[PDB]
Amino acid sequence: LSKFGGECSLKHNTCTYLKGGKNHVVNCGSAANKKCKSDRHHCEYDEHHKRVDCQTP
């Protein structure tokens, strides 16, 4: 189980992370502290507890 880093889309509210040649897209969530707030902001997806965060510094 790993964490993956990517970048978020402000328009689409998604985190896109690259893994083994595949871009995986996950919705950031709509909570105020989870949604993408700045285009191409760093985001992370953690397979431990399926956590997505689009506000991670």
β pairing state of 3-9 and 14-19: antiparallel
Give, in order, the Cα–Cα distances in Å from 3 to each of 10, 11, 29, 56: 21, 24, 17, 12
Which residue, 34, 33, 36, is CA-closest to 11? 36
The token pair that represents 57 in the structure block: 């510094």
Q: Where does residue 32 rank: exposed (0-12), middle (13-18), buried (19+ CB within 10 A)?
A: exposed
Do residues 37 and 55 make contact, with C-beta atoms less than 8 angstroms apart?
yes
Which token pair is 6?
């990517």
| Separation of alpha carbons 54 and 57, rounded Å | 9
Determined by which method?
A: X-ray
The token duo for 14 is 């998604």
Identify the three-state secondary structure at position 7: strand
**String of DSSP letters for 12-56:** TTEEEEEETTEEEEEE--SSTTTS--STT-EEEEETGGGEEESS-
